[PDB]
Amino acid sequence: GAMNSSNYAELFNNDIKLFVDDTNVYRVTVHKTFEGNVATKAINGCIFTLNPKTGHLFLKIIHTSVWAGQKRLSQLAKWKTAEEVSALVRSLPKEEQPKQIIVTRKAMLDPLEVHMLDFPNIAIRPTELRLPFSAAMSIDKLSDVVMKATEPQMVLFNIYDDWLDRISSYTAFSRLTLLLRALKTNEESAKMILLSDPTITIKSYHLWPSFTDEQWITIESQMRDLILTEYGRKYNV
Amino acid sequence: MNTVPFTSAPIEVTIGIDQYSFNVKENQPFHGIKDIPIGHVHVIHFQHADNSSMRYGYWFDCRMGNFYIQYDPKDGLYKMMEERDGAKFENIVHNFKERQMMVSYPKIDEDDTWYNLTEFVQMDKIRKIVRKDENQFSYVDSSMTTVQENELSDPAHSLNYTVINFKSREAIRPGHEMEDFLDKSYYLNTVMLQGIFKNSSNYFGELQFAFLNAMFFGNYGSSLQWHAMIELICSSATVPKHMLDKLDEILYYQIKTLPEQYSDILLNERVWNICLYSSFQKNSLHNTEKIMENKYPELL
Numbered sequence: 001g002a003m004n005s006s007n008y009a010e011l012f013n014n015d016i017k018l019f020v021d022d023t024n025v026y027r028v029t030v031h032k033t034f035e036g037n038v039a040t041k042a043i044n045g046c047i048f049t050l051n052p053k054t055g056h057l058f059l060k061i062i063h064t065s066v067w068a069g070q071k072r073l074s075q076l077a078k079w080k081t082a083e084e085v086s087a088l089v090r091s092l093p094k095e096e097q098p099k100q101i102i103v104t105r106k107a108m109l110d111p112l113e114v115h116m117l118d119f120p121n122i123a124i125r126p127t128e129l130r131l132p133f134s135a136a137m138s139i140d141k142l143s144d145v146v147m148k149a150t151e152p153q154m155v156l157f158n159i160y161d162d163w164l165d166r167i168s169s170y171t172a173f174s175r176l177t178l179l180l181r182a183l184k185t186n187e188e189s190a191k192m193i194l195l196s197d198p199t200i201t202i203k204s205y206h207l208w209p210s211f212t213d214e215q216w217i218t219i220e221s222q223m224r225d226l227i228l229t230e231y232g233r234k235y236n237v
Numbered sequence: 238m239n240t241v242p243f244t245s246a247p248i249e250v251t252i253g254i255d256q257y258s259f260n261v262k263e264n265q266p267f268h269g270i271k272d273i274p275i276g277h278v279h280v281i282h283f284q285h286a287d288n289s290s291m292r293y294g295y296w297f298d299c300r301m302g303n304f305y306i307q308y309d310p311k312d313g314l315y316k317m318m319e320e321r322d323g324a325k326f327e328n329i330v331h332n333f334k335e336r337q338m339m340v341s342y343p344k345i346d347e348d349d350t351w352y353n354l355t356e357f358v359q360m361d362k363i364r365k366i367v368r369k370d371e372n373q374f375s376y377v378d379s380s381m382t383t384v385q386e387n388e389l390s391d392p393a394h395s396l397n398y399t400v401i402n403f404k405s406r407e408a409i410r411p412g413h414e415m416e417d418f419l420d421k422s423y424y425l426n427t428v429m430l431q432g433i434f435k436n437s438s439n440y441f442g443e444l445q446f447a448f449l450n451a452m453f454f455g456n457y458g459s460s461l462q463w464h465a466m467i468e469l470i471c472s473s474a475t476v477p478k479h480m481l482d483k484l485d486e487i488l489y490y491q492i493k494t495l496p497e498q499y500s501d502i503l504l505n506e507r508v509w510n511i512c513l514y515s516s517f518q519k520n521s522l523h524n525t526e527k528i529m530e531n532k533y534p535e536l537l
């Protein structure tokens with residue numbers, strides 16, 4: 001059934017699983033037409049498919065051409081997501097295929113279930129967690145590869161950089177969701193925190209800066225402060 | 238006109254015959270039902286006074302044999318049986334009539350209710366859903382599960398309705414996943430109508446039989462089957478015009494006949510609201526939508 005606070009440690013056991021987040025698949029800018037009506041212009045998007053144990057991120061990049069001449073794009077986006085994820089599972093060797101796929105939004109359950117009928121033994125699950133994966137396009141290197149794509153493409157990342165050399169996947173996932181929660185609540189502030197010190201850099205093969213353990217604790221404190229702040233600024237407390 | 242005699246009525250029971258019924262008393266001198274219209278299937282059904290648990294009954298067609306009821310004190314129920322001695326049968330029936338020991342099937346002449354509920358129902362198809370080939374009539378009761386329910390336990394005592402499952406490889410063509418799930422016409426017309434049922438008459442007959450088992454026995458799996466067969470049509474953008482017209486009539490008479498007090502347990506809110514208001518056929522069931530809105534507007 002659904003994934004929640006009570007069964008949180010299952011994310012880090014040794015059964016292969018993937019999160020799928022579809023919130024950045026269909027992206028638009030809304031603008032006025034010469035006649036003063038409103039229209040949308042699609043921009044490139046991405047499916048965010050993440051192994052929470054290993055950090056392996058399968059970024060399937062959704063080029064605007066896939067929407068040409070289609071109707072009801074928000075509904076099509078869920079099915080295209082399910083179509084791309086099922087193609088990815090087929091692409092992977094049997095022993096790498098997931099035993100569960102957790103979708104971050106319940107409207108992905110039926111599209112994915114239907115695309116995965118060939119895999120009766122892969123559990124398709126919702127979650128009650130409010131995860132912040134929509135903020136993946138606030139990671140500069142991910143946003144850049146999405147916006148530069150001229151055709152469909154799947155780029156592979158480790159969203160944990162080398163953190164697992166020093167910390168467990170539970171701690172790595174907690175750090176990731178704190179960073180992304182901060183970027184979602186106040187992107188400018190969050191990015192200022194991450195980059196204010198020019199001496200700590202992002203390796204070419206990494207997404208986040210090369211913080212020492214001590215520096216991560218400071219960073220993590222700063223991100224909690226930010227989220228608490230915004231929560232007051234927002235609610236006046 | 239045909240007759241189903243009773244040997245006796247040793248236990249107090251409410252006896253149904255089609256949409257009619259009446260409470261009979263323990264050892265009250267009851268010897269059956271006469272004047273039963275030829276040309277239709279019929280169902281004779283029972284609810285004991287001392288245990289309103291287990292409604293049960295028999296589907297039959299008088300053209301296929303001489304049938305009677307006899308209480309079995311070991312198995313504790315009224316059993317249908319076939320009398321093969323035709324002379325012996327006519328003699329018994331004539332004596333019981335002479336002694337006016339039979340109630341009369343009380344068909345009002347204006348009334349096409351039973352015809353309209355059983356228009357497409359055929360004994361030969363009932364006997365394939367309810368497997369027991371040594372008898373020409375078919376036993377059904379409240380508790381019998383369907384083959385699909387058994388998948389999700391005694392197979393000899395199951396209702397073998399045609400399995401409908403909207404999230405199944407049979408329903409969904411590889412490569413048309415979204416198309417086939419949002420518009421079920423392929424599954425209705427190619428898979429079910431052309432492939433399994435052969436024609437819409439057989440489809441409507443199974444649907445009508447499932448409704449009647451849901452209504453007369455409270456058979457839950459039959460209710461599930463009735464709604465699935467409605468929903469498959471309503472969820473198809475492409476349905477022959479004659480099938481939509483006939484479905485509207487079929488459903489109209491089903492809703493008309495349903496006991497007002499059972500509408501809470503025999504009608505699935507989600508399916509009906511979807512079918513009348515969101516589906517491809519939301520505007521195609523005028524008679525059914527009018528009677529539903531005037532009779533069960535709470536459900537909607």
Ligand SMILES: CCC(CC)NC(=O)Nc1cccnc1
Pocket residue numbers: 060083084085087088089091152154
């Ligand atoms: C280009 C259209 C096809 C058919 C859906 N997509 C596809 O092969 N997607 C894919 C392939 C391999 C790994 N991940 C995703």
